[PDB]
Amino acid sequence: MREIVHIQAGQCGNQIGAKFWEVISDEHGIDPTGSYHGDSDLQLERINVYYNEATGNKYVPRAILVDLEPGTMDSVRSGPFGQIFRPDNFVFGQSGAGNNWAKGHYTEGAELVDSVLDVVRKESESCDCLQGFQLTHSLGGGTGSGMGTLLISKIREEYPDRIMNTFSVMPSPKVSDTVVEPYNATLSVHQLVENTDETYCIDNEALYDICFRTLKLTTPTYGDLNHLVSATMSGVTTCLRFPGQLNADLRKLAVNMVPFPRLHFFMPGFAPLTSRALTVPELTQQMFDSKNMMAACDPRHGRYLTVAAIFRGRMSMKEVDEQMLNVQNKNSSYFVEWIPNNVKTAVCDIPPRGLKMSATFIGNSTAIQELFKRISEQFTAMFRRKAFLHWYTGEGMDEMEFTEAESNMNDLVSEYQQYQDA
Amino acid sequence: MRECISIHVGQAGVQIGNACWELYCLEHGIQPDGQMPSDKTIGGGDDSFNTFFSETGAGKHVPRAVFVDLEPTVIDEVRTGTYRQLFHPEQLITGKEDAANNYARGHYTIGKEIIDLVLDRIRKLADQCTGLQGFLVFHSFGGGTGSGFTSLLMERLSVDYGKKSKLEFSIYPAPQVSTAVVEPYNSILTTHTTLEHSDCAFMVDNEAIYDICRRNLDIERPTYTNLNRLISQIVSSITASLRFDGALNVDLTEFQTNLVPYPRIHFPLATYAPVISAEKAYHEQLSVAEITNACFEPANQMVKCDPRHGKYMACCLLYRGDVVPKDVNAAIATIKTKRSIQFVDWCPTGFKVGINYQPPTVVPGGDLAKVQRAVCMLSNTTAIAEAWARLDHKFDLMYAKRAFVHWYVGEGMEEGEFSEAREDMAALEKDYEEVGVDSV
Numbered sequence A: 001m002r003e004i005v006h007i008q009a010g011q012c013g014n015q016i017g018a019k020f021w022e023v024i025s026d027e028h029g030i031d032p033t034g035s036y037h038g039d040s041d042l043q044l045e046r047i048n049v050y051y052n053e054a055t056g057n058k059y060v061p062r063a064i065l066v067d068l069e070p071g072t073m074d075s076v077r078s079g080p081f082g083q084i085f086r087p088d089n090f091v092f093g094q095s096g097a098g099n100n101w102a103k104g105h106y107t108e109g110a111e112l113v114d115s116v117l118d119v120v121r122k123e124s125e126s127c128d129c130l131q132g133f134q135l136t137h138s139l140g141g142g143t144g145s146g147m148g149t150l151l152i153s154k155i156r157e158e159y160p161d162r163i164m165n166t167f168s169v170m171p172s173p174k175v176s177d178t179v180v181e182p183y184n185a186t187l188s189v190h191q192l193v194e195n196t197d198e199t200y201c202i203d204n205e206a207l208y209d210i211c212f213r214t215l216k217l218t219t220p221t222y223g224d225l226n227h228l229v230s231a232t233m234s235g236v237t238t239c240l241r242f243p244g245q246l247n248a249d250l251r252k253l254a255v256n257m258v259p260f261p262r263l264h265f266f267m268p269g270f271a272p273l274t275s276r277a278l279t280v281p282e283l284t285q286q287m288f289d290s291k292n293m294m295a296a297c298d299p300r301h302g303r304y305l306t307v308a309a310i311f312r313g314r315m316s317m318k319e320v321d322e323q324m325l326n327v328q329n330k331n332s333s334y335f336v337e338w339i340p341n342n343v344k345t346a347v348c349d350i351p352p353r354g355l356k357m358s359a360t361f362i363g364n365s366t367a368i369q370e371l372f373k374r375i376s377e378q379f380t381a382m383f384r385r386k387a388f389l390h391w392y393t394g395e396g397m398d399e400m401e402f403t404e405a406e407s408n409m410n411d412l413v414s415e416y417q418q419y420q421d422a
Numbered sequence B: 001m002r003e004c005i006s007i008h009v010g011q012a013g014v015q016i017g018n019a020c021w022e023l024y025c026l027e028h029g030i031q032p033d034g035q036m037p038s039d040k041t042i043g044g045g046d047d048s049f050n051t052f053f054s055e056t057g058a059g060k061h062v063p064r065a066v067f068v069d070l071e072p073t074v075i076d077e078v079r080t081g082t083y084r085q086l087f088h089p090e091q092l093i094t095g096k097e098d099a100a101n102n103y104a105r106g107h108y109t110i111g112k113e114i115i116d117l118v119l120d121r122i123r124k125l126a127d128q129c130t131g132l133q134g135f136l137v138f139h140s141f142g143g144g145t146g147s148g149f150t151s152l153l154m155e156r157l158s159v160d161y162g163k164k165s166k167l168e169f170s171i172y173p174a175p176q177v178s179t180a181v182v183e184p185y186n187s188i189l190t191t192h193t194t195l196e197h198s199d200c201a202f203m204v205d206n207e208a209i210y211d212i213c214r215r216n217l218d219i220e221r222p223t224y225t226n227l228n229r230l231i232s233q234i235v236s237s238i239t240a241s242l243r244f245d246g247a248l249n250v251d252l253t254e255f256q257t258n259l260v261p262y263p264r265i266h267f268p269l270a271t272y273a274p275v276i277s278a279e280k281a282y283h284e285q286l287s288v289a290e291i292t293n294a295c296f297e298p299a300n301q302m303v304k305c306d307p308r309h310g311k312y313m314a315c316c317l318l319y320r321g322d323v324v325p326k327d328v329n330a331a332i333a334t335i336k337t338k339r340s341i342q343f344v345d346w347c348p349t350g351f352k353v354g355i356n357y358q359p360p361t362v363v364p365g366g367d368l369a370k371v372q373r374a375v376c377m378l379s380n381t382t383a384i385a386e387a388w389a390r391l392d393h394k395f396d397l398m399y400a401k402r403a404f405v406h407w408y409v410g411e412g413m414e415e416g417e418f419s420e421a422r423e424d425m426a427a428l429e430k431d432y433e434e435v436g437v438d439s440v
């Protein structure tokens, strides 16, 4: 359990993926040319989880960049850290996917997927002991969503005993590109329910609200949304990236977080929310606050099956333990009683850039059903009139596949509701 | 990559083509000899303007366009006029005898004699493309060539280019400038035969453009030249996303995803603002909010109909020039708090927005004020079917007595084709009613 292979697919996937690499490269002291210039050994101890070491003490992200059009990856390559990525790990077509899951999954994506897998295989081949994969993508478009889930299936077939983890951006009318997003997201969710072990549900609804309501951003851009995402992604991978006891690899995280295989969709949260001194008590209260959650679900509307909390910075561990106990002891009703001691806490001395201390929240809450119900309602409003379906049937799909995807997502909802009441 | 080939068919198609390509040249800094000093890659490139222009080694920027007409006198003006060096002669194709306002002659008798050559020349354009996206076809509904030759061509393009995208700009007839009594026949025949071969069609009602010219530009008696300059601004607005790049730019194909809920329901209503004289524009800066407001005034629509009496299935705003999202969003919020914008119950109500920062241009000697910002709204409204209703009624009046039908029958057509086309139109009007009815 050491190496992770990172993949980022499509426009959203690549934009947030690029930001993730910028952020953690800074945290690990790796500059845009892959040279190390940090002042702490904590930085390099587990650097091999995410980076290969090339010649000249150069560190290279174990990262594969995928798209069905070149535009966003041209931008990535021009980006500040664009030169750090391995040039042969850019795999792209020219056709685009037109926000169409069928094109990403069955036609345009089909034609490209083998070459992605050649690169993945070359990455896995140099791994001393691959843990598994993390994928960044959105569910509302065509490439990240349709081709991204195609990839996950092929990867599982080839590495069926490795962990699959995703950061999956869920669409919202509030931050929407096309009307077919609910279709692409429902089709993708069924894939995720079956073929990932752990999925961070990143809700563009939540991201927008935080930017608007909390950060006082009148007109949030995708860039502002991605600030929150990259901050969250750094937080939730801290335990994989730095020496530590708890959830230090992807399988142990799954074992701590997933009591039933399908219910592996996590609501992440972060504090303090950023666009000059925070106390452990304040971090703890803010990390559990709905307003700090990146999935637009009311956690008081459900129950926590499991929780992982990660605190970063120099702070009193005694105080951390006290505050974490205080949260559970004073709101014990929201933690299912049939999983004793279901909240685990890690502390890492290195804080993220620009903060003295911070906290990241990963919840497996039954309230996540609210996010799937929302997608399900939007899907049905259209599907009942078969609206916009020609875009999909034109790529060889039939309606039955929509009925099935819908049924399985409603099953998922019913399954959360079951443990909410147990 | 992403090349678009324009095909201009018959008089209206060709003359609108003249206006659009002149405008594109001005927008991109292309001289009438085809030179473009700002373009530093000689003889090729993958710039955004390359979707519409190829380049020769000598630095000429050549429209990816074919002009076709069955008589020569309109294209002869292109051959001899200001942009004559812009086009290779083989891009401009003419017969000797026109379709005489008769769909049958355009589709069959006369059209059949030049169709293989036209496809040959289009094929030559296609072969120079590395990632052809599709075709934009410009034509009248009312002319014999615009109707019948266009239909034939669209049918042949489906065969030869499979599902490659085909979009139309279709000139819908008005009595103020129409030239044939039988235009309603030609309009129904071509709409029926083309409907399965077109992915998306922007109708331009000559009467709407005529009224806008009379009312907003104070032109006493608009000519084709007046009409065409305004049409070209609208066409330019719709194609700008293909020809320019930009952070806030949204591809026409993405708007199309939202605009077309079912294959047959593929006729967006375009609305354009601001159309204002130099005299009125001077010292009067129309704000984002003002031009957005203007999009919901029916007088500014390119097709006469009343969206306030129909239902929306999509609303898209294509901005150009000095425009930022903050101002757009605020403008839209106001409009919602004050307008008859009712959506069908099965569609989301969010407006889809794109912004191209390149400001609008005008042709020297024209009527439109040069403005800092403009907008084209593309909406999918059930109200557009009113245009089909008006046309279908005129067809019925004549067809009931079989007036003029012998002109078509004499060219080899059967009454069966008339009834078949009219029934397809009846079914289309019914389609537009059905999509507006609430879900059960």
Ligand SMILES: Nc1nc2c(ncn2[C@@H]2O[C@H](COP(=O)(O)OP(=O)(O)OP(=O)(O)O)[C@@H](O)[C@H]2O)c(=O)[nH]1
Binding pocket: B009, B010, B011, B012, B013, B015, B016, B069, B070, B071, B098, B099, B100, B101, B102, B106, B139, B140, B141, B142, B143, B144, B145, B146, B147, B171, B172, B173, B174, B177, B178, B179, B183, B206, B224, B225, B227, B228, B231
């Ligand atoms: N807006 C606009 N409409 C035009 C123009 N020229 C012709 N029309 C309209 O187009 C219709 C007549 O069809 P045309 O395009 O002239 O005829 P054609 O396609 O050349 O067909 P044939 O002459 O019969 O072979 C009428 O409704 C005219 O008002 C033009 O330059 N601009």
Ligand SMILES: Nc1nc2c(ncn2[C@@H]2O[C@H](COP(=O)(O)OP(=O)(O)O)[C@@H](O)[C@H]2O)c(=O)[nH]1
Binding pocket: A009, A010, A011, A012, A013, A015, A016, A097, A098, A099, A100, A138, A139, A140, A141, A142, A143, A144, A145, A169, A170, A171, A172, A175, A176, A177, A181, A204, A207, A222, A223, A225, A226, A229
């Ligand atoms: N948070 C975030 N969401 C994005 C970004 N780009 C696109 N999206 C969302 O992703 C969906 C569109 O899919 P996209 O990734 O652009 O399409 P693809 O390239 O075919 O995968 C919509 O839900 C958008 O709101 C981004 O940079 N950040």
Ligand SMILES: [Ca+2]
Binding pocket: A111
């Ligand atoms: Ca191909």
Ligand SMILES: [Ca+2]
Binding pocket: B039, B040, B041, B042, B043, B044, B045, B046, B047, B055
């Ligand atoms: Ca060039």
Ligand SMILES: [Mg+2]
Binding pocket: A011, A012, A141, A177
């Ligand atoms: Mg996109």
Ligand SMILES: [Mg+2]
Binding pocket: B010, B011, B069, B071, B098, B099, B143, B145
């Ligand atoms: Mg003519």
